[PDB]
Tab-separated table of N, CA and C in Angstrom:
chain	number	residue	atom	x	y	z
A	1	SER	N	-16.051	-20.785	155.516
A	1	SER	CA	-16.815	-21.952	154.986
A	1	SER	C	-17.281	-22.914	156.084
A	2	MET	N	-18.260	-23.735	155.721
A	2	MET	CA	-18.747	-24.755	156.604
A	2	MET	C	-17.677	-25.844	156.749
A	3	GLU	N	-16.977	-26.209	155.655
A	3	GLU	CA	-15.876	-27.206	155.785
A	3	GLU	C	-14.834	-26.750	156.865
A	4	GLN	N	-14.364	-25.485	156.771
A	4	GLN	CA	-13.358	-24.922	157.718
A	4	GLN	C	-13.807	-25.092	159.156
A	5	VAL	N	-15.057	-24.769	159.432
A	5	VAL	CA	-15.663	-25.011	160.775
A	5	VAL	C	-15.688	-26.486	161.235
A	6	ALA	N	-16.052	-27.389	160.302
A	6	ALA	CA	-16.100	-28.848	160.616
A	6	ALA	C	-14.693	-29.335	160.991
A	7	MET	N	-13.698	-28.912	160.192
A	7	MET	CA	-12.275	-29.138	160.444
A	7	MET	C	-11.876	-28.656	161.845
A	8	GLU	N	-12.297	-27.431	162.156
A	8	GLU	CA	-12.020	-26.812	163.441
A	8	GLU	C	-12.657	-27.549	164.593
A	9	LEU	N	-13.880	-28.034	164.390
A	9	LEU	CA	-14.554	-28.851	165.409
A	9	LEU	C	-13.772	-30.182	165.676
A	10	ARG	N	-13.220	-30.800	164.622
A	10	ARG	CA	-12.362	-32.013	164.727
A	10	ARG	C	-11.045	-31.667	165.470
A	11	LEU	N	-10.398	-30.554	165.123
A	11	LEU	CA	-9.200	-30.107	165.844
A	11	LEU	C	-9.523	-29.919	167.335
A	12	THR	N	-10.689	-29.342	167.611
A	12	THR	CA	-11.099	-29.079	168.972
A	12	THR	C	-11.336	-30.364	169.705
A	13	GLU	N	-11.939	-31.334	169.030
A	13	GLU	CA	-12.178	-32.610	169.695
A	13	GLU	C	-10.859	-33.404	169.929
A	14	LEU	N	-9.964	-33.373	168.962
A	14	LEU	CA	-8.633	-33.955	169.121
A	14	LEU	C	-7.908	-33.328	170.325
A	15	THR	N	-7.993	-31.990	170.425
A	15	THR	CA	-7.429	-31.234	171.529
A	15	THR	C	-8.032	-31.673	172.833
A	16	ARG	N	-9.353	-31.925	172.875
A	16	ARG	CA	-9.984	-32.452	174.097
A	16	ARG	C	-9.402	-33.806	174.472
A	17	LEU	N	-9.275	-34.678	173.491
A	17	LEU	CA	-8.773	-36.042	173.761
A	17	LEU	C	-7.276	-36.008	174.173
A	18	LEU	N	-6.461	-35.214	173.480
A	18	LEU	CA	-5.051	-35.043	173.866
A	18	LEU	C	-4.844	-34.446	175.263
A	19	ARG	N	-5.732	-33.547	175.684
A	19	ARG	CA	-5.654	-33.002	177.035
A	19	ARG	C	-5.817	-34.081	178.084
A	20	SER	N	-6.788	-34.948	177.889
A	20	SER	CA	-6.982	-36.067	178.783
A	20	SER	C	-5.750	-37.066	178.743
A	21	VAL	N	-5.264	-37.374	177.545
A	21	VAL	CA	-4.035	-38.154	177.392
A	21	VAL	C	-2.878	-37.495	178.190
A	22	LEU	N	-2.732	-36.180	178.074
A	22	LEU	CA	-1.655	-35.449	178.729
A	22	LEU	C	-1.746	-35.594	180.234
A	23	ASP	N	-2.975	-35.527	180.738
A	23	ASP	CA	-3.203	-35.632	182.185
A	23	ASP	C	-2.847	-36.975	182.701
A	24	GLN	N	-3.247	-38.009	181.978
A	24	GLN	CA	-2.903	-39.380	182.335
A	24	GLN	C	-1.397	-39.668	182.299
A	25	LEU	N	-0.701	-39.085	181.327
A	25	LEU	CA	0.777	-39.270	181.223
A	25	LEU	C	1.481	-38.542	182.354
A	26	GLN	N	1.034	-37.330	182.619
A	26	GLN	CA	1.617	-36.576	183.681
A	26	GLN	C	1.373	-37.226	185.066
A	27	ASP	N	0.266	-37.954	185.262
A	27	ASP	CA	0.077	-38.684	186.538
A	27	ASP	C	1.118	-39.770	186.740
A	28	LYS	N	1.717	-40.253	185.656
A	28	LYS	CA	2.778	-41.202	185.736
A	28	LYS	C	4.143	-40.612	186.092
A	29	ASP	N	4.145	-39.323	186.424
A	29	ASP	CA	5.343	-38.577	186.883
A	29	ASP	C	4.985	-37.900	188.211
A	30	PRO	N	4.684	-38.691	189.274
A	30	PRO	CA	4.241	-38.034	190.527
A	30	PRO	C	5.345	-37.199	191.168
A	31	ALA	N	6.610	-37.529	190.889
A	31	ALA	CA	7.728	-36.667	191.325
A	31	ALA	C	7.869	-35.282	190.625
A	32	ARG	N	7.156	-35.067	189.521
A	32	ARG	CA	7.222	-33.820	188.764
A	32	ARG	C	8.604	-33.506	188.179
A	33	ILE	N	9.361	-34.565	187.852
A	33	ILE	CA	10.687	-34.445	187.209
A	33	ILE	C	10.592	-33.781	185.813
A	34	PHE	N	9.476	-34.028	185.142
A	34	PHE	CA	9.236	-33.579	183.750
A	34	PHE	C	8.196	-32.458	183.579
A	35	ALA	N	7.750	-31.893	184.703
A	35	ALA	CA	6.743	-30.827	184.747
A	35	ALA	C	7.083	-29.522	184.048
A	36	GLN	N	8.353	-29.142	184.116
A	36	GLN	CA	8.818	-27.823	183.707
A	36	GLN	C	10.103	-27.938	182.871
A	37	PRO	N	10.408	-26.933	182.052
A	37	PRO	CA	11.675	-27.006	181.301
A	37	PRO	C	12.868	-27.158	182.211
A	38	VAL	N	13.877	-27.889	181.759
A	38	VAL	CA	15.167	-27.873	182.453
A	38	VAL	C	15.668	-26.389	182.533
A	39	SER	N	16.061	-25.973	183.728
A	39	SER	CA	16.513	-24.580	183.983
A	39	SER	C	17.894	-24.300	183.390
A	40	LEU	N	17.990	-23.311	182.516
A	40	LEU	CA	19.277	-22.961	181.948
A	40	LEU	C	20.113	-22.198	182.956
A	41	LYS	N	19.471	-21.563	183.942
A	41	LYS	CA	20.221	-21.027	185.094
A	41	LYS	C	20.956	-22.139	185.857
A	42	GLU	N	20.255	-23.208	186.206
A	42	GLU	CA	20.837	-24.356	186.952
A	42	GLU	C	21.619	-25.431	186.134
A	43	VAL	N	21.341	-25.525	184.827
A	43	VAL	CA	22.129	-26.377	183.899
A	43	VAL	C	22.542	-25.539	182.689
A	44	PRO	N	23.581	-24.675	182.892
A	44	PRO	CA	23.925	-23.717	181.845
A	44	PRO	C	24.406	-24.335	180.557
A	45	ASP	N	24.993	-25.534	180.603
A	45	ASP	CA	25.453	-26.256	179.381
A	45	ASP	C	24.361	-27.067	178.618
A	46	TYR	N	23.098	-26.943	179.055
A	46	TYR	CA	22.082	-27.954	178.675
A	46	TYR	C	21.903	-28.030	177.164
A	47	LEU	N	21.846	-26.878	176.528
A	47	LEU	CA	21.632	-26.805	175.088
A	47	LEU	C	22.854	-27.234	174.256
A	48	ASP	N	24.063	-27.331	174.850
A	48	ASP	CA	25.182	-28.016	174.195
A	48	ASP	C	24.893	-29.522	174.047
A	49	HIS	N	24.063	-30.069	174.949
A	49	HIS	CA	23.739	-31.504	174.981
A	49	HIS	C	22.450	-31.820	174.234
A	50	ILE	N	21.416	-31.056	174.532
A	50	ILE	CA	20.059	-31.372	174.123
A	50	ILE	C	19.598	-30.233	173.197
A	51	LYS	N	19.398	-30.581	171.934
A	51	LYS	CA	18.994	-29.611	170.923
A	51	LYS	C	17.517	-29.217	170.887
A	52	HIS	N	16.630	-30.097	171.337
A	52	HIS	CA	15.204	-29.777	171.374
A	52	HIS	C	14.631	-30.173	172.750
A	53	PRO	N	14.800	-29.298	173.747
A	53	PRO	CA	14.226	-29.563	175.054
A	53	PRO	C	12.702	-29.671	175.001
A	54	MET	N	12.159	-30.426	175.952
A	54	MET	CA	10.742	-30.562	176.034
A	54	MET	C	10.372	-30.857	177.478
A	55	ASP	N	9.126	-30.580	177.815
A	55	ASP	CA	8.599	-30.772	179.180
A	55	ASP	C	7.064	-30.666	179.134
A	56	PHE	N	6.399	-31.099	180.180
A	56	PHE	CA	4.927	-31.138	180.173
A	56	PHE	C	4.261	-29.739	180.122
A	57	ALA	N	4.894	-28.711	180.702
A	57	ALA	CA	4.298	-27.371	180.652
A	57	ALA	C	4.331	-26.821	179.221
A	58	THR	N	5.452	-27.023	178.536
A	58	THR	CA	5.626	-26.562	177.164
A	58	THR	C	4.614	-27.338	176.253
A	59	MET	N	4.400	-28.639	176.480
A	59	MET	CA	3.391	-29.414	175.716
A	59	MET	C	1.997	-28.855	175.949
A	60	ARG	N	1.711	-28.542	177.218
A	60	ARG	CA	0.440	-27.965	177.584
A	60	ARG	C	0.179	-26.588	176.911
A	61	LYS	N	1.158	-25.699	176.807
A	61	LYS	CA	0.929	-24.439	176.057
A	61	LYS	C	0.612	-24.715	174.579
A	62	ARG	N	1.359	-25.622	173.964
A	62	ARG	CA	1.088	-25.963	172.577
A	62	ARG	C	-0.344	-26.571	172.403
A	63	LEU	N	-0.693	-27.472	173.290
A	63	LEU	CA	-2.001	-28.078	173.314
A	63	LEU	C	-3.108	-27.033	173.315
A	64	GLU	N	-3.037	-26.070	174.226
A	64	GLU	CA	-4.131	-25.123	174.418
A	64	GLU	C	-4.216	-24.051	173.345
A	65	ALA	N	-3.142	-23.855	172.591
A	65	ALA	CA	-3.197	-23.136	171.328
A	65	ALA	C	-3.642	-24.033	170.169
A	66	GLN	N	-4.215	-25.206	170.472
A	66	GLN	CA	-4.523	-26.212	169.440
A	66	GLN	C	-3.381	-26.422	168.436
A	67	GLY	N	-2.142	-26.497	168.930
A	67	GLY	CA	-0.968	-26.662	168.062
A	67	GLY	C	-0.584	-28.094	167.701
A	68	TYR	N	-1.293	-29.097	168.221
A	68	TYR	CA	-1.067	-30.473	167.744
A	68	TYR	C	-2.127	-30.845	166.670
A	69	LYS	N	-1.694	-31.001	165.434
A	69	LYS	CA	-2.640	-31.369	164.335
A	69	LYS	C	-3.065	-32.843	164.364
A	70	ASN	N	-2.267	-33.715	164.983
A	70	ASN	CA	-2.529	-35.172	165.008
A	70	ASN	C	-1.792	-35.815	166.220
A	71	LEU	N	-2.133	-37.046	166.571
A	71	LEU	CA	-1.483	-37.757	167.684
A	71	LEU	C	0.014	-37.942	167.484
A	72	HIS	N	0.444	-38.125	166.243
A	72	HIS	CA	1.877	-38.301	165.939
A	72	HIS	C	2.733	-37.128	166.487
A	73	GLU	N	2.315	-35.927	166.192
A	73	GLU	CA	2.974	-34.705	166.700
A	73	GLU	C	3.091	-34.648	168.234
A	74	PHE	N	2.020	-35.016	168.902
A	74	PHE	CA	1.936	-35.047	170.339
A	74	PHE	C	2.879	-36.086	170.901
A	75	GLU	N	2.835	-37.276	170.361
A	75	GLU	CA	3.799	-38.339	170.694
A	75	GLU	C	5.274	-37.972	170.479
A	76	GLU	N	5.573	-37.237	169.406
A	76	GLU	CA	6.932	-36.776	169.184
A	76	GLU	C	7.438	-35.945	170.377
A	77	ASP	N	6.607	-35.025	170.835
A	77	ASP	CA	6.940	-34.182	171.996
A	77	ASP	C	7.076	-35.028	173.273
A	78	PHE	N	6.209	-36.017	173.457
A	78	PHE	CA	6.312	-36.877	174.645
A	78	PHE	C	7.622	-37.702	174.653
A	79	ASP	N	7.952	-38.217	173.491
A	79	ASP	CA	9.174	-38.953	173.297
A	79	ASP	C	10.437	-38.103	173.543
A	80	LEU	N	10.440	-36.827	173.142
A	80	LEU	CA	11.520	-35.891	173.455
A	80	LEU	C	11.726	-35.774	174.924
A	81	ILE	N	10.636	-35.705	175.691
A	81	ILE	CA	10.792	-35.592	177.138
A	81	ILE	C	11.639	-36.773	177.658
A	82	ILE	N	11.287	-37.981	177.198
A	82	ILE	CA	11.896	-39.206	177.664
A	82	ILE	C	13.312	-39.332	177.150
A	83	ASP	N	13.453	-39.102	175.847
A	83	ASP	CA	14.698	-39.377	175.151
A	83	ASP	C	15.784	-38.375	175.552
A	84	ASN	N	15.420	-37.113	175.745
A	84	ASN	CA	16.351	-36.083	176.211
A	84	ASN	C	16.918	-36.482	177.567
A	85	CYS	N	16.019	-36.909	178.438
A	85	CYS	CA	16.398	-37.274	179.818
A	85	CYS	C	17.356	-38.463	179.857
A	86	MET	N	17.067	-39.491	179.053
A	86	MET	CA	17.902	-40.679	178.960
A	86	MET	C	19.276	-40.467	178.311
A	87	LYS	N	19.458	-39.360	177.589
A	87	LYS	CA	20.753	-39.050	177.051
A	87	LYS	C	21.556	-38.195	178.069
A	88	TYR	N	20.925	-37.176	178.647
A	88	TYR	CA	21.594	-36.227	179.538
A	88	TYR	C	21.967	-36.886	180.838
A	89	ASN	N	21.124	-37.783	181.351
A	89	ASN	CA	21.385	-38.407	182.627
A	89	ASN	C	21.865	-39.845	182.497
A	90	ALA	N	22.768	-40.232	183.384
A	90	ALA	CA	23.266	-41.598	183.392
A	90	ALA	C	22.210	-42.574	183.876
A	91	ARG	N	22.424	-43.811	183.506
A	91	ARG	CA	21.530	-44.930	183.837
A	91	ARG	C	21.238	-45.096	185.332
A	92	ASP	N	22.221	-44.817	186.182
A	92	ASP	CA	22.066	-45.017	187.621
A	92	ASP	C	21.409	-43.802	188.382
A	93	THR	N	20.660	-42.947	187.690
A	93	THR	CA	20.182	-41.718	188.286
A	93	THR	C	18.706	-41.840	188.455
A	94	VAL	N	18.221	-41.103	189.446
A	94	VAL	CA	16.798	-40.996	189.650
A	94	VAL	C	16.079	-40.435	188.408
A	95	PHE	N	16.714	-39.511	187.703
A	95	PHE	CA	16.102	-38.907	186.524
A	95	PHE	C	15.923	-39.918	185.406
A	96	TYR	N	17.005	-40.645	185.078
A	96	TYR	CA	16.936	-41.648	183.999
A	96	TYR	C	15.861	-42.674	184.338
A	97	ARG	N	15.912	-43.185	185.562
A	97	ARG	CA	14.952	-44.176	185.978
A	97	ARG	C	13.499	-43.667	185.942
A	98	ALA	N	13.298	-42.389	186.260
A	98	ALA	CA	11.955	-41.792	186.155
A	98	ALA	C	11.451	-41.750	184.678
A	99	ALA	N	12.353	-41.487	183.723
A	99	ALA	CA	12.007	-41.531	182.321
A	99	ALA	C	11.616	-42.914	181.846
A	100	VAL	N	12.378	-43.927	182.245
A	100	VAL	CA	12.057	-45.251	181.875
A	100	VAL	C	10.647	-45.598	182.343
A	101	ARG	N	10.351	-45.282	183.603
A	101	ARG	CA	9.069	-45.610	184.190
A	101	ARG	C	7.911	-44.900	183.465
A	102	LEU	N	8.110	-43.629	183.154
A	102	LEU	CA	7.124	-42.838	182.371
A	102	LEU	C	6.896	-43.410	180.985
A	103	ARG	N	7.976	-43.812	180.315
A	103	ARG	CA	7.898	-44.436	179.008
A	103	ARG	C	7.027	-45.723	179.079
A	104	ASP	N	7.381	-46.601	180.014
A	104	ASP	CA	6.696	-47.882	180.139
A	104	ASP	C	5.207	-47.732	180.460
A	105	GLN	N	4.925	-46.889	181.451
A	105	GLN	CA	3.587	-46.575	181.851
A	105	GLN	C	2.806	-45.777	180.820
A	106	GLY	N	3.483	-44.895	180.101
A	106	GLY	CA	2.827	-44.101	179.082
A	106	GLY	C	2.399	-44.906	177.878
A	107	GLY	N	3.156	-45.966	177.561
A	107	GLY	CA	2.890	-46.847	176.405
A	107	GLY	C	1.461	-47.352	176.314
A	108	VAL	N	0.927	-47.690	177.475
A	108	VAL	CA	-0.421	-48.250	177.655
A	108	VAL	C	-1.460	-47.197	177.267
A	109	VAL	N	-1.244	-45.976	177.754
A	109	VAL	CA	-2.142	-44.848	177.549
A	109	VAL	C	-2.160	-44.481	176.073
A	110	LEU	N	-0.976	-44.385	175.498
A	110	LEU	CA	-0.798	-44.053	174.072
A	110	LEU	C	-1.341	-45.130	173.105
A	111	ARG	N	-1.266	-46.387	173.520
A	111	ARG	CA	-1.792	-47.498	172.748
A	111	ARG	C	-3.309	-47.347	172.554
A	112	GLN	N	-4.035	-47.005	173.633
A	112	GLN	CA	-5.467	-46.825	173.563
A	112	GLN	C	-5.830	-45.494	172.878
A	113	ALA	N	-5.040	-44.450	173.122
A	113	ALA	CA	-5.294	-43.182	172.460
A	113	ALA	C	-5.246	-43.312	170.927
A	114	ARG	N	-4.299	-44.071	170.398
A	114	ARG	CA	-4.206	-44.303	168.960
A	114	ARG	C	-5.454	-45.012	168.423
A	115	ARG	N	-5.930	-46.013	169.160
A	115	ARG	CA	-7.178	-46.697	168.803
A	115	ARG	C	-8.342	-45.676	168.811
A	116	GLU	N	-8.451	-44.827	169.856
A	116	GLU	CA	-9.521	-43.781	169.948
A	116	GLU	C	-9.505	-42.687	168.862
A	117	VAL	N	-8.317	-42.313	168.407
A	117	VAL	CA	-8.146	-41.338	167.341
A	117	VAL	C	-8.538	-41.915	165.967
A	118	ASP	N	-8.108	-43.144	165.686
A	118	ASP	CA	-8.567	-43.913	164.500
A	118	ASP	C	-10.091	-44.177	164.542
A	119	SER	N	-10.538	-44.770	165.646
A	119	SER	CA	-11.954	-45.092	165.890
A	119	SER	C	-12.892	-43.875	165.684
A	120	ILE	N	-12.770	-42.833	166.520
A	120	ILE	CA	-13.595	-41.600	166.387
A	120	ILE	C	-13.219	-40.682	165.199
A	121	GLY	N	-12.222	-41.051	164.383
A	121	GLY	CA	-11.777	-40.224	163.249
A	121	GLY	C	-10.948	-39.052	163.745
């Protein structure tokens, strides 16, 4: 149907906008602490601690399969990156502090993205 295609064009445009959002958030992690999944080889107990791991590469695969239906879903995954890190690592660690900084800096980007998603439909 023509409706199905119009829907698909909106998903595609959302995917375009989320890709740019993703790039901007990832620039706020110049150390690449959140680039890749936590290694189960190097942290064998990780899944005893963290039930839903997340990282920027895993978000990027979902993105390019057009697997985010709305900004809320995308934000949930971004928040997992931050929240997982702040639970697993202590406050006095480079990792915890990197999450805080990403959260604070990401807030600005996400604030405007929400306006753009509402605005452009």
